[PDB]
Amino acid sequence: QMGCKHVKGILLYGPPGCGKTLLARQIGKMLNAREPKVVNGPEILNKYVGESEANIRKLFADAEEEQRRLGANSGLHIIIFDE
Amino acid sequence: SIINPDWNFEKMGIGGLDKEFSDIFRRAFASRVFPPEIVEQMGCKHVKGILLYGPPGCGKTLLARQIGKMLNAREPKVVNGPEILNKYVGESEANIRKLFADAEEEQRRLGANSGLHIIIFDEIDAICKQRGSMAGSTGVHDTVVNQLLSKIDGVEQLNNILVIGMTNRPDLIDEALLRPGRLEVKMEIGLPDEKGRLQILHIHTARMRGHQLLSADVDIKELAVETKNFSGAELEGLVRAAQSTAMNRHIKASTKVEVDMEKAESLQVTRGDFLASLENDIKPAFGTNQEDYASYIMNGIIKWGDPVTRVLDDGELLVQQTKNSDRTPLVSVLLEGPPHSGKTALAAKIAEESNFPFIKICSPDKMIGFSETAKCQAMKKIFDDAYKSQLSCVVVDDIERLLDYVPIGPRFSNLVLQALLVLLKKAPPQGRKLLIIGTTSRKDVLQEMEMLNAFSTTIHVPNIATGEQLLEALELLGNFKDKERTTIAQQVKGKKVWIGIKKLLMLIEMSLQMDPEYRVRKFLALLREEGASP
């Protein structure tokens, strides 16, 4: 009825040694959803032209497919960007 | 016709883009209004270029998709970023040709009655780059640009394609292409106003009013006035944050996630939540106009004698003179007085009392450790910024500290002095006005350099001289009892006093640290020690 949209972005920052990667892990484990994806730094870069973009696009394929298939009543997919 | 019957201004929910939308419609669909007979009689070509650019959070994508929806024809084709580039050689040109092949074939088959097709480009700057300005690695970029240029307008010409592109860095686009016939119309999108803010807020609050989810204490006009320099995205985020804050008031956490299931229909949003969200959650991103006055005015202003009123009246008179005059578009004055007299506070108050659209303050506090050339560039940039608006007031405080002046030698900087002298008599462009107010504490030094003559006039800012002023200030502060006040008076009436307001405040606050039995004597001793002055 309110016609509101959910937030889809969180950023954490601070000096070294306080608990960012613990908070992220706990948040990922808390939700009763599919296992989250993880990216370790610039692990998506590649040598052959036009492969980094394909790697980035492959991340969101499942979410788009679920949205298309089950419409609004769909699950939640978590993506964790490290560094 | 080519326009869907459902078109309507409200249905798209756009904000303060009335003029831009009207211009777009006029210059991109007018030729499509009259029947074929008249347009053929004119025998004129059609528009084949549209490019929308502006800062983030403006609504380019929303406008583009609304325009696409409004058009009644085949589903417009969409390119989602730079996905055209592929590794096997020759695939970028294949895809770009495959993009227009359907339109080419349809127009060829249908002759001169072909339908209208439009393609939506997202992140245009990614694919097209200046051919001359580029590395010599491989040319998967130059070939794509050349193929696109040939396709849009080559040997064969087409009149059923319109290119629409959204970008954020217009200078990165290639200049050789943005010419008539390919990209002729180019518009600039800025920031909405209070009217647009009100309209946008109403658009986003429609559902709650429809279901009466907002309490009567909500005032759209007051909210719009409060938020300044915001954007549509910021307004939507603020509304969402306020809704979330209001909704959170029926959740118990840290033990078990539970909700009433019965009080959920008693939810409402108040104003206090709106201010809380505005002050704690949202913060403006596009520049700012928060000329912090609490920092400069940390204790307000208290009327302790005529001089404050006289200074305020003189400032008001000067402001009126500059506002309602044309023979002297540039007018400036100088504020000077003994140390610790509150010159900067009075200057800031005088500047704030004016309702000029653009008010800025330049102080050395920001330039700490800067080189001997950065200061000139900063002042030039500030004065250039202040030139744009019709009316503007600039306050230069602590002049003596802006030249590095020191009484040994003496030493100072010539370049900054020359820059300030030149910038203090350059008249603004035609049909504009400007005001400059300066502060300082050494009239003789400025006189020696022959810079005081440039200023039109000066205003004196004296300090407490008589005891009766001290008693009035103490009464205004209300930091003593009747007996203590009488005791202090019985001594101060003996002779005269000379102490600035800031020094007086510091002395009283230092004296307030002793026990009640000794506060008065310590205060008197401190005043006597510091009162050694004419």
Place this chain on the structure above:
Amino acid sequence: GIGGLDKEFSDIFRRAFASRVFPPEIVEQMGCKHVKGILLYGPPGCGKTLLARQIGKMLNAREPKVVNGPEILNKYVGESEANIRKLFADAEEEQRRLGANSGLHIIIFDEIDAICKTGVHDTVVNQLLSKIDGVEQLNNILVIGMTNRPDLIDEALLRPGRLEVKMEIGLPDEKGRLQILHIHTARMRGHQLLSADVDIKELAVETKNFSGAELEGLVRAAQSTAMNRHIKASTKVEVDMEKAESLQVTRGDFLASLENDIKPAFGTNQEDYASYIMNGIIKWGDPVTRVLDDGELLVQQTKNSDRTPLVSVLLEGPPHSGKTALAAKIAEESNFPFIKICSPDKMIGFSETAKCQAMKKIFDDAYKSQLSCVVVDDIERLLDYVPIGPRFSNLVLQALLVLLKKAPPQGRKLLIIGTTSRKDVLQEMEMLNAFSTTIHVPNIATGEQLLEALELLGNFKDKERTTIAQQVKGKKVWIGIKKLLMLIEMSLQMDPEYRVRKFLALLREEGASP
């Protein structure tokens, strides 16, 4: 066909056709060289193509070769050089068949900078250079190219004997541009879609830095505005549908459409001088007449002089006496082909080197004319000066002293005017000797002059003027014109009754004597 290049046309004729008329035998025996290198650069348009065709047509040669941009380039390698050898195969065959007197081959390039300026670029450049000039001799090669970045060409093409002709393209004129507008609008004129009240003559006259693209764009904007006149949009997509039978476009709509849609691209320059004169000049006394007469005498001496091609004058006076305005007025009245003004405002924060470079550039630009006048104002602010020390920049002073005694090329004149408010400082620096003479600009001395100036301004009525004269006539006054206007404006703020008292008090406070 082409104007403004008659002498340049003769020069090109001598450069090109001088070595071609002679029979090949005598030239070969003597050993003379040939001219086969031409390059072009200028504003985009038909002028380049017109010049190329005019040059090509006169020669009794076959059809020239024209390439539109990087046509040779392809997706793969080897295509760029495939056409180069095919084009010159016929030239080589003709050279080997007819010998020395072989049919001329002409090559024309469009936007060659795209291919000549990463193996593709250098390979193409090397192939083109080898084909144009190499071990094999080609006596029938003519090359013409048009680019907007001539200075970016490779060093190899700059070798002597490869690029011997330097030329610049012309600019649109009033009659030619009028013809272009006529050809464009012939369609509407035949269809009677243009109102008879529109004049194209003054419209073309006022155009500055407008090319064909700009013309077609503003024409299209005018057509769109005419289409909109009948339309009733901004409320719906429905219109009258009846007024279309009668339609015409007034010149006002043309101006409105073309003045807020497009603007010139290739820069925009103007000689705006009103910025230095905000309130004109009012004759408040005799000295201004004497100053103007002296300026006119100096101008006529410079114009008619033969032994002294360079003459300089110095303007002197107290501060706030109106020196820059008088110099600007004199310069404007001089009516010389080239006039420029150098002020410190344009250079804020610039170091000594930048100021010296700017002064040198401005003087070099002024030199190239036949006769011009240059005015420098606020000399002290030009070479930063401070009474403490004292301190100043020596480089700028030396540059000024050198430039104040340098004659221009023989057969040209020049005039220099300087304004300043410190005679003693300049005299101590040993600069006042260079200037030929000096002029003075006094302030308001007698109260009668002040009353006359006030009457000319017309800001006070007779009743107040009588009292002011009675109070001030019995005393001497010393006030500057700019300060006088500032004081008058300040006093005008208050009510009509208290103006006199405040004005008199302010004048008394500002009063001073020499």
Place this chain on the structure above:
Amino acid sequence: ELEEMQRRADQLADESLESTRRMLQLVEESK
């Protein structure tokens, strides 16, 4: 996709070589 097509082309080339060898052997026997 493309790799499968290249593998099929290589297999076709191998089959062509085998056919040529069989042709040569058959003609030799026929002699």
Place this chain on the structure above:
Amino acid sequence: AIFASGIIMDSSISKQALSEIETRHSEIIKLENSIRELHD
């Protein structure tokens, strides 16, 4: 430290090495059948 890394564009797949390779082999079937019949 003037230096720069590089990006690659493969070509080991040619879309024109599938036309001739397939057309070339399509004609030997008749010859093989004819020679088999001749030998039989």
